[PDB]
Design a protein around this ligand. Structure first.
Ligand SMILES: O=C(O)[C@H]1O[C@H](O)[C@H](O)[C@@H](O)[C@@H]1O
Ligand SMILES: [Cl-]
Length: 308
C-alpha cells in the first residue's frame, strides 16, 4: 500500500487525535486496499515547526499546525492571528467555514509546498501564570511568557509591557517547572492534557485570540491524487473537521472541571484594558499587509451577524 503519514503534537486523548483517527477510518474504509494512513501523535514527527518543514518536502503528507506559526511561511495567514478579532465563537466558526474567506488563505503557500485543507477548533487563548494572578496587562510586566513561534504574538507581548519566550509546545511544561518562564497562554486543554496546571494555578480569561489549528497537506502529493481518490480524501478532511469539533466541545468542558480539581483558579478579568493595549497590533498588521483588509471586512460582517 501507499503509506500516508500524518502528524500532530497532541496526546492520543485530544480531539485532534480522535478526529484524525476518524479521518483514517473513513478513508481506509473506502480505499483501504490502497492507502495505509498512519497517524503520529505527541510530536513523534517533531515539533510543529519540524512537521511543517517535513510537509513542505513531502517527507510526511499531512500535519496539523497552529495558524500562529504559518504566518512565517506566508504573511497572509496573519489575518487569523490578530488579537480580539472575533466577536464570538459563533462568528469565528462561521468565518472558518466560509470558503470565500479561507480558501485564498489556505492556498497561499502552494509555492512553499503545502496547502490548508481544513481547520480544527482550539478554543480561545488566555494567560496563565505560576506566581501572580493576571488581572490587567500591567501584571505581565517583568514576566517571561511563552508564546508560539509567531512574530505577531511576540509583538502582542511587547505591547502588553511583557516579554515573549517563543518555543515549541512540548517544551512548555518543563520550562514552567524549571522557572525559565513565568507563564504561558492557551486554551484550557493545556492545563490538563499537557499538565501545565500542575505548575500554573492562575488562569485568567482575557481571551486575546481564537487561533485555528490548520490541517496542511503536501501540495504535490495532494494534487497528484487520482480524481476519485482526491474526492475521498476531501470527504475525509470534512469528517476530520466535524469529529474534532464535536470532540473539542466535550474535551474542553472536561478540561475545565479537571483543572478545577487540580487546584486551578479561574479569573474573569476586564478585557477592555487588554483590547486597548494590543489594538496597535491590528492597526500595524493591516497597514503593512494590504492583502488583509478585504478578509478583515468580511470577518466584521460575521461579527455583526453573530455578536457577543
Ligand atoms: O500553543 C501551542 O503551541 C499549541 O496551542 C494549542 O494546543 C494548539 O492547538 C496547538 O496547535 C499548538 O501547538
Ligand atoms: Cl514548534
Amino acid at each position: 500500500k501507499t503509506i500516508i503519514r500524518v502528524g500532530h503534537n497532541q496526546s492520543q486523548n485530544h480531539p485532534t487525535h480522535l478526529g484524525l483517527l476518524a479521518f483514517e477510518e473513513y478513508v481506509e474504509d473506502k480505499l483501504g486496499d490502497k492507502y495505509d494512513i498512519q497517524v503520529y501523535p505527541s510530536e513523534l514527527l517533531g515539533s510543529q515547526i519540524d512537521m511543517v518543514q517535513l510537509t513542505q518536502t513531502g517527507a510526511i503528507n499531512i500535519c496539523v499546525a497552529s495558524n500562529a506559526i504559518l504566518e512565517t511561511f506566508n504573511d497572509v495567514w496573519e489575518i487569523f492571528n490578530l488579537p480580539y478579532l472575533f466577536a464570538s465563537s459563533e462568528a469565528y466558526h462561521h468565518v472558518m467555514d466560509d470558503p470565500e474567506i479561507v480558501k485564498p488563505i489556505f492556498e497561499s503557500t502552494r509555492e512553499g509546498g503545502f496547502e490548508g485543507v481544513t481547520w480544527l477548533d482550539a478554543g480561545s487563548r488566555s494567560f496563565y501564570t505560576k506566581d501572580k494572578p493576571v488581572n490587567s496587562p500591567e501584571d505581565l510586566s517583568g514576566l517571561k511568557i511563552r508564546v508560539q513561534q509567531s512574530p505577531t504574538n511576540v509583538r502582542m507581548m511587547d505591547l502588553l509591557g511583557s516579554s515573549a519566550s517563543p518555543m515549541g509546545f512540548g517544551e512548555v511544561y518543563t520550562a514552567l517547572q524549571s522557572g525559565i518562564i513565568d507563564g504561558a497562554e492557551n486554551n484550557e486543554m493545556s492545563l490538563t492534557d499537557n499538565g501545565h496546571g500542575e505548575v500554573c494555578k492562575y488562569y485568567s480569561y482575557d481571551m486575546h485570540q481564537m487561533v485555528p489549528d490548520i490541517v496542511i497537506a503536501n501540495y504535490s502529493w495532494l494534487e497528484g491524487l487520482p480524481e476519485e481518490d482526491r474526492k475521498v480524501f476531501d470527504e475525509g478532511f470534512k469528517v476530520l473537521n466535524e469529529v474534532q469539533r464535536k470532540e473539542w466541545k466535550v474535551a474542553v468542558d472536561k478540561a475545565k472541571e479537571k483543572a478545577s480539581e487540580m487546584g486551578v483558579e479561574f479569573i474573569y478579568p476586564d478585557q477592555k484594558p487588554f483590547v486597548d493595549a494590543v489594538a496597535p497590533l491590528t492597526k500595524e498588521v493591516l497597514e503593512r499587509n494590504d492583502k488583509l483588509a478585504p478578509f478583515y471586512d468580511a470577518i466584521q460582517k460575521y461579527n455583526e451577524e453573530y455578536p457577543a
